[PDB]
Amino acid sequence: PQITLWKRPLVTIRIGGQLKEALLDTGADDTVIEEMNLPGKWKPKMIGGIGGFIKVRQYDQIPVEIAGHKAIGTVLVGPTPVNIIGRNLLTQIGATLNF
Amino acid sequence: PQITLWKRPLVTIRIGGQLKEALLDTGADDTVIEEMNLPGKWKPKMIGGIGGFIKVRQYDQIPVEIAGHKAIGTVLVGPTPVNIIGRNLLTQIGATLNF
Ligand SMILES: CC(C)[C@@H]1NC(=O)CCCCOc2ccc(cc2)C[C@@H](C(=O)O)NC1=O
Ligand SMILES: CC(C)[C@@H]1NC(=O)CCCCOc2ccc(cc2)C[C@@H](C(=O)O)NC1=O
């Protein structure tokens, strides 16, 4: 689809079998999802944002369906204001910026 | 143009008479520019994201050219690690997400 930006580009995703709302974020290198239980082993990691650094749980090779498009990659779980789909998964679904 | 997301979508912008590199960020409501001695009246503001909040100076009706496309609006100036072009200006240049 083509999504304009008058509002936050929020879309529904399925991860770990559960539905969640997430923001398509071209300003994010990584995908960061609010605290939740995800299958598999995770590794402690730290990532930075506009306000500083946070500790996250790094899960690798996680399937995430974004607005009907499939991606399988790294998902960081931790204290984020809103769920963020970053470039690692946006590239997988063939998302581009256009103007 | 079309910008892929394999790498950070950095483009050249012109603001306050200076050329800078900035990130086209669909996950940002506002535009935040690295500390620069911009003239004009401003209002105090706090913006948040991953890691927490930072204090910025809010300037209104500031002309900002983005890869040749003219825009004008609110620009927040503060200790951001990267210049960020947010939705307030992305809509002005007709930018969309597509997949
Ligand atoms: C969501 C983070 C994993 C991402 N943070 C990253 O992509 C890692 C680099 C963080 C420091 O540099 C920044 C780069 C970009 C931004 C802020 C800071 C914009 C901001 C956003 O989503 O709007 N991006 C981030 O906070
Ligand atoms: C790049 C920042 C301005 C930030 N945008 C970001 O930090 C990128 C997304 C981080 C997680 O999602 C958000 C977190 C916080 C917000 C919006 C989104 C609130 C909103 C604000 O304070 O006005 N912050 C942003 O849009």
Curated annotation (Swiss-Prot), chains A, B:
- Domain Peptidase A2, chain residue ranges per copy: 20-89
Gene name, per UniProt, is gag-pol
Subunit structure, as described in the record? Homodimer, whose active site consists of two apposed aspartic acid residues.
Protein name (database record): Protease
Q: What function does the entry list?
A: Aspartyl protease that mediates proteolytic cleavages of Gag and Gag-Pol polyproteins during or shortly after the release of the virion from the plasma membrane. Cleavages take place as an ordered, step-wise cascade to yield mature proteins. This process is called maturation. Displays maximal activity during the budding process just prior to particle release from the cell. Also cleaves Nef and Vif, probably concomitantly with viral structural proteins on maturation of virus particles. Hydrolyzes host EIF4GI and PABP1 in order to shut off the capped cellular mRNA translation.
Tell me the segments the record calls region Dimerization of protease.
1-5, 49-55, 88-99
- Please give the superkingdom of this protein's source: Viruses
The active site consists of: 25 (for protease activity)
Q: Specify first residue, last residue and whole-protein length for the fragment.
A: 491 to 589 of 1437
